[PDB]
Structure 1
């Protein structure tokens, strides 16, 4: 579909068996989800934005479905105020910017 930018581009995602709302973010290198209890091994990571860095848990080869489009990649979990879908997964769903 086509998503205009008058409002935050929030869409429904499916991850770890749960439905969530997430922001499609061309300004994010990584995908970062609000605190949730995913199984498996993880590695610590620090990610940086406006204001500074937060500590997150890095999970690899995680399946996320974004508006019916499936993607598999690295998913970070930590104290973000918003679920963010970053470029690592947006490329997998064929998402482009157009003007």
Structure 2
């Protein structure tokens, strides 16, 4: 699909059998999700946004469907204002910017 930016690019994602809303974010290197329970072990990671750095939990090889497109990759879980789909997963679904 072609998505214009007059409105926030929110899409529906499916993770852990649940539907959630997430933002297609080209300015985010990583994918960061709000607090939830994910399988396996986690590693620590510090990530910096606009207001500073936060601590998140890193989970690898997590399956997540974005608009019907399956992706499997690294997801970070921490205190985020909204679920964010970053470049690591945007590249998997073949997302590009055009103008």
3-state SS of 2:8 partner: coil
CA deviation after TM superposition for structure 1 residue 54, in Å = 1.0
Deviations 1:33-80 (A, max 9, x none): 001111211011111010101111000010110000111110000110
Show structure 2 runs of 5+ residues with no match.
Answer: none
Show structure 1 runs of 5+ residues with no match.
Answer: none
User: Which 4+ runs in 1 deviate beyond 2 A?
Assistant: none
Normalization by structure 1: what TM-score?
A: 0.97
3-state SS of 2:61 partner: strand
Q: Pairwise CA RMSD of aligned residues?
A: 0.6
Normalization by structure 2: what TM-score?
A: 0.97
